[PDB]
């Protein structure tokens, strides 16, 4: 959301488009725009966090399962706590003894 929140996508993009329009970008392509394509890139800019567990890889070896996608209890909180989201994701597929 820090990159493509709907409030940003509306306000900032319409302001940039209006500035481009008043400068005359749509009359002729000479003008240089300033982020008038933000709604086209929703969910693409810094939308993920990938962490490889080096200790787990060292413990497992050459043959291992690669990766897992983990959805948190709160769907839109990883951007607030990147480290907590990664640790909660790594809580899942660990060595287990009972």
């Amino acid at each position: 959301p820090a990159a493509d929140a709907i409030a940003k996508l509306i306000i900032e993009t319409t302001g940039n488009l209006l500035g481009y329009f008043l400068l005359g970008g749509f009359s002729s392509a000479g003008t240089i725009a300033a982020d008038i394509i933000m709604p086209f890139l929703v969910g693409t800019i810094a939308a993920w966090l990938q962490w490889k567990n080096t200790g787990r890889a060292t413990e497992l070896g050459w043959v291992h399962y690669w990766e897992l996608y983990q959805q948190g209890a709160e769907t839109n909180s990883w951007s607030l706590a990147a480290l907590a989201a990664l640790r909660g994701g790594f809580l899942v597929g660990r060595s287990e003894t009972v």
């Binding site: 897992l68 959805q71 597929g93």
Partner: protein, 42 residues
């Protein structure tokens, strides 16, 4: 000799000594083998 005693009880099958606990555990193990790989990791 064999026909008409324990040797035909064996043909009868699980009429004499046979417990429910390991039978239920084996059924659960077979179902777990069937369903565990397809259960999601979440």
């Amino acid at each position: 000799s064999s026909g008409g005693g324990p040797a035909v009880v064996n043909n009868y099958g699980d009429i004499h000594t046979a417990n429910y606990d390991e039978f239920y555990k084996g059924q659960q193990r077979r179902e777990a083998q069937q369903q565990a790989p397809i259960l999601p990791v979440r």
